[PDB]
């Protein structure tokens, strides 16, 4: 996920983006900071939540985490389309 945040955010709603980064370990204050700084703006909220996860976690072994997270909780129906883009 070097520069892939914008495209992959186009498949996932805000519920799935937040629900994935939260299970990774992003602080709930940081989620609040983006929400209160980008209220009434869902498009920017998705990118900044996913960008900080890429910062909180790091670069190495980036893509392997999203595939497991986005399909473990019986959400593999649309998870096949994400690999087509990559």
């Amino acid at each position: 996920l070097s520069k892939y945040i914008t495209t992959i955010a186009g498949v996932m709603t805000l519920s799935q983006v937040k629900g994935f980064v939260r299970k990774n370990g992003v602080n709930e204050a940081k989620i609040d900071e983006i929400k209160n700084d980008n209220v009434q703006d869902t498009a920017e909220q998705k990118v900044q939540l996913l960008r900080n996860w890429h910062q909180l976690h790091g670069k190495k072994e980036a893509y392997d985490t999203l595939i497991k997270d986005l399909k473990k909780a019986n959400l593999c129906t649309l998870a096949e389309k994400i690999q087509t883009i990559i």
Partner: protein
């Protein structure tokens, strides 16, 4: 300069969240206000100024490894990883 090459990786990869790197790297709040006043409409220059003040305070201690460790402590790692990756490459 060895630090300058690793500095440009940080001045160009973090934007609004420069206050975290400034405060969690031994820089006060009045100095942060001075940085904001000096660059009213600028972010990369603000990050550079915060890093420069940190390097001036640390002097001899201000080596790359401490910078990467402090970045890691600041909940950010990609810029810490990038300066590390450049360090091995350069």
């Amino acid at each position: 300069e060895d630090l300058c090459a690793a500095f440009n990786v940080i001045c160009d990869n973090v934007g609004k969240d420069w206050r975290r790197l400034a405060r969690q790297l031994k820089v006060s709040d009045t100095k942060i206000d001075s940085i904001e006043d000096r660059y009213p409409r600028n972010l990369t220059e603000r990050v550079r100024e915060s890093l420069r003040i940190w390097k001036n305070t640390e002097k001899e201690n201000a080596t790359v490894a401490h910078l990467v460790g402090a970045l890691r402590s600041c909940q950010m790692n990609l810029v810490a990883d990038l300066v590390q990756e450049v360090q091995q490459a350069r």
